Structure formats: C-alpha cells, structure tokens
Amino acid sequence: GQGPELHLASQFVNEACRALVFGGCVEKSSVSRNPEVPFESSAYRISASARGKELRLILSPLPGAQPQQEPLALVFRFGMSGSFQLVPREELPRHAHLRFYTAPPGPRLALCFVDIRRFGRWDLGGKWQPGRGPCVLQEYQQFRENVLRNLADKAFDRPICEALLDQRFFNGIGNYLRAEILYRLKIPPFEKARSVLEALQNPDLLELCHSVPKEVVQLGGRGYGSESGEEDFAAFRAWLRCYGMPGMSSLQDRHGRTIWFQGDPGPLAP
DNA sequence: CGTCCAGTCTAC
DNA sequence: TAGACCTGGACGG
Numbered sequence A: 001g002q003g004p005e006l007h008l009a010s011q012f013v014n015e016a017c018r019a020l021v022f023g024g025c026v027e028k029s030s031v032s033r034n035p036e037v038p039f040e041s042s043a044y045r046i047s048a049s050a051r052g053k054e055l056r057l058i059l060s061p062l063p064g065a066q067p068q069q070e071p072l073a074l075v076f077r078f079g080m081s082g083s084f085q086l087v088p089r090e091e092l093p094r095h096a097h098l099r100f101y102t103a104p105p106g107p108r109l110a111l112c113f114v115d116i117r118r119f120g121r122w123d124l125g126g127k128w129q130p131g132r133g134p135c136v137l138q139e140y141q142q143f144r145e146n147v148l149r150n151l152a153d154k155a156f157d158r159p160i161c162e163a164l165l166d167q168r169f170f171n172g173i174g175n176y177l178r179a180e181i182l183y184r185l186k187i188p189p190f191e192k193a194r195s196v197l198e199a200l201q202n203p204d205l206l207e208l209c210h211s212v213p214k215e216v217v218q219l220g221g222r223g224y225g226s227e228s229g230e231e232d233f234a235a236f237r238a239w240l241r242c243y244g245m246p247g248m249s250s251l252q253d254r255h256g257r258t259i260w261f262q263g264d265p266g267p268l269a270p
Numbered sequence B: 001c002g003t004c005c006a007g008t009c010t011a012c
Numbered sequence C: 001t002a003g004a005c006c007t008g009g010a011c012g013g
Helices: A003-016 A140-149 A175-185 A193-198 A205-217 A230-239
Strands: A022-028 A037-051 A054-061 A072-077 A082-088 A096-101 A109-115 A121-123 A249-252 A258-261
Touching (some): A003 A054, A003 A082, A003 A205, A140 A205, A175 A205, A175 A258, A193 A205, A205 A230
Antiparallel strands (some): A022 A037, A022 A096, A072 A121, A249 A258
16 A cells, blocks of 8 residues: 555544454464564454554553553554455455454454555554654645755655655655656656755645645545445546556666656656 | 566665 | 565466
8 A cells, every 4th residue: 555545544444443342362364474462452442543654553442451451552564465454253354464353242343454465564663664754644744844854865866756655755655656646747757856856945746745645535445445345446547647547658667666657758767 | 377567675 | 776575366378
C-alpha cells in the first residue's frame, strides 16, 4: 500500500473494531520472520492511525481486564501486499501472519494482518520510523517545510521521479502516486528534483503530493486494492490517468522501478 | 511447463 | 548501487 491504502486500512480497523472486544494473545504465523507480540488481555479494544506509509495499532485493555497490562502499540509497514481484514476465526485467509481474536459475546471474528509476499514488517516500539518525513496526508504543512528546508540535501540531485519515492521527504508517496502527481503538472519524470522544487519557496508539485493521494482516500474504497468489492477497484482503475494507462510512456528509474509519464522523458533520463 | 511483473532493507 | 526478500496472476510455448 501507499499512504491512501495505509490511511484507509487505519479507517477500516477503527470502524470495524469500534464495537468489538478482543481477548487472549496476539497470534503470529509460523513462517513470519517478524517478532512475536508479547500481549495478553481478557478484554481489549484495537484502534489505528496512519502516518505516511506506516500504520500504528493500539491494543487497549478495558478496566479490570486480566492479566494486568498497559496499552501496547505496534507499527506496521505493508510492503507490496500488506493489508488488514476482519474474517470469521475459522476462515483465516492464507497469508494471515498476525491475528487478534474477538472475545465472547457474539460471532468469533479475527482481525488479521495479511501479507502474501511478506515484504511487510512490524515493530514492538510504537514509534514511527526515525528518518521518515511527515505524512503528506495528515501533516501537509510540516511535510512541505521539511522539503523546502532541505533542498541542499543530495536526495534532490536525483531526478524528480526518484526523489518522490524517498520516504525521508515524501512519506506516503509510492509508484502510482508519483506517476499521477507528475502527470497532473506535465513535469518530465527525469527533470532534476532540485530544479522543480527550487521554484517554490496555484497547485504546485508539493501541494499535489497532498491533494492527489487525498483524492484516492475520498474515493472511499481501499485505494489500489479491493477489500470492499471489485466495484471499489474499478472506481480506482477509473481515477488513474497515467499509471499503467494505454498511450503512456514508461521507463525504469535507477532502482529498476517503472515510472509512467506523457511525452518529454526529461534531461536525466537513462 | 517457463518468464515476467507487481517497497523497503542490507551487504558490497 | 544491486540483489535479496516473497507469492501469485497473466502470459507465452
């Protein structure tokens, strides 16, 4: 997922778990090389928030829950196939690698972190990744200042299409979003990052870094993805103007990732 | 059957 | 930097 997917996943956990009570331990698949979550409670609520391409779960025991336990926070990154689902306990999807189980009363459901390719990761801390910049969705003004303060950084030597993936400055921006963002401004993907950014110091490249992914969120649905029908997925394919679309050029950036664009590749093209 | 394609993380 | 980390769907023979 990218920021919209991480953001919509957090909204999903919050709405789906609002009137649910979990109990017991936090179960991990045998094959997952991520850490065992040391946590047990007779009764606890799960909530979420999203920051860029990371999602924080808070496991929050109720008054009187046993064993005695302070709230616990997990941060997740999704890599290529991470996701959250609420399923019936005996119908776990195949790659459900971490699982929170409802307590009686009611239907026994499982909140599952599902990650086919297992590029996703979680940490016990609860801290955001040091070095990741502010959320382009929820921290726009902080994100905007963080780029304009640091144009001197060597990151901005690189072509614009590569800089937009550097999560130190564009936390939340991934492959589809960089294509869609540059297509909106007809900015060649291999223009130099510093060149396009120095200008700003209406809608400019940094503003679109916020407004474009906000468009994905306001589709409702589950971004690139279909957790709420194939209808929501068709809604997304329709929103796209550039990424994967017929009549568009594509190249490889210096890290082998496909950038989609119209017309001028730009000066720093391979 | 085979190939190729879809975000970090870490060892050169 | 370049390869490593993974599974599965869409192709081509």
